[PDB]
């Protein structure tokens, strides 16, 4: 996360870290949507251009975390993956269209002050809230900047980072890039004229873009961190998987096939 701040304890209790067993490393963010289901970006698991094609046993999910590198004894819960489900029309060839994946946990995770699921949006909540200018919140452990001077500056955070960002008008998203944008994406970030900055960055992939509904005061995951060109570049925006647009696939995966 670029130009964010340290999260408060328990601020994002659905935040999930995707962790490579060997070598032990952060792969991506993710989010908890029930006691057995974790949502992330397809490209966190499958990206042939980078020879990336992870199997269940390659990965753990760590839930309830705050510190990036510490093992948070008595707080985090580390879970093994039962199954990975990638959207069958995930377009890794061109533009990361439908950048979404589910992970089933081998065992349900116990909820706590630090571990709690986020809601997924229904049509009405998405229609009300996914409006240009409305702000959501992005969280992750990814890099603090696109570039820095090695062993002199600092590019990675000690703990979970948070930034609030406004949804951007679709023509502005489209005019910011040569990549083909789809209805399964929205973009977010401040314009150069606006005062403020902020973006996701490498390692934030797959984590949640959330909004707090003013109707029922619940947090809804509207987006998944998907792609950008650079991080926090002027005139560029971060692009997010439109969770509601893919919810019928989510429901199918959970309701008919996985339950």
């Amino acid at each position: 996360i670029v130009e964010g701040s340290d999260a408060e304890i328990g601020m994002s209790p659905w935040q999930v870290m995707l962790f490579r067993k060997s070598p032990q490393e952060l792969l991506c963010g993710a989010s908890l949507i029930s006691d057995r289901w974790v949502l992330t970006a397809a490209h966190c698991l499958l990206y042939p251009p980078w020879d990336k094609n992870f199997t269940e046993n390659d990965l753990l999910v760590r839930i309830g975390k705050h510190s990036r590198t510490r093992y948070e004894r008595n707080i985090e819960k580390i879970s093994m993956l039962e199954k990975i489900y990638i959207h069958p029309r995930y377009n890794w060839r061109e533009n990361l269209d439908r950048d979404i994946a589910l992970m089933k946990l081998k065992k349900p995770v116990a909820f706590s002050d630090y571990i709690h699921p986020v809601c997924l949006p229904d049509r009405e909540t998405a229609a009300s809230l996914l409006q240009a200018g409305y702000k959501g919140r992005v969280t992750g452990w990814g890099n603090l900047k696109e570039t820095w001077t090695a062993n002199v500056g600092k590019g990675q955070p000690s703990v979970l980072q948070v930034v609030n960002l406004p949804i951007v008008e679709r023509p502005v998203c489209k005019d910011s890039t040569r990549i083909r944008i789809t209805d399964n994406m929205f973009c977010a970030g401040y314009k150069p004229d606006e005062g403020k900055r902020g973006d996701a960055c490498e390692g934030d992939s797959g984590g949640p873009f959330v909004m707090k509904s003013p109707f029922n005061n619940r947090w809804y995951q509207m987006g998944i961190v998907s792609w950008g060109e650079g991080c926090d570049r002027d005139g560029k925006y971060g692009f997010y998987t439109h969770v509601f647009r893919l919810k019928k696939w989510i429901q199918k995966v959970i309701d008919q096939f996985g339950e």
């Binding site: 409305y134 619940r218 947090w219």
Partner: peptide, 28 residues
């Protein structure tokens, strides 16, 4: 889940985090 999106350390005890007001204020 019935209690989705309600954080134990915030909504469940009617405490706000330090920047959620920024989100509310944008929903005009």
């Amino acid at each position: 889940e019935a209690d989705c999106g309600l954080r134990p350390l915030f909504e469940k005890k009617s405490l706000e985090d330090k920047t959620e007001r920024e989100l509310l204020e944008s929903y005009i």
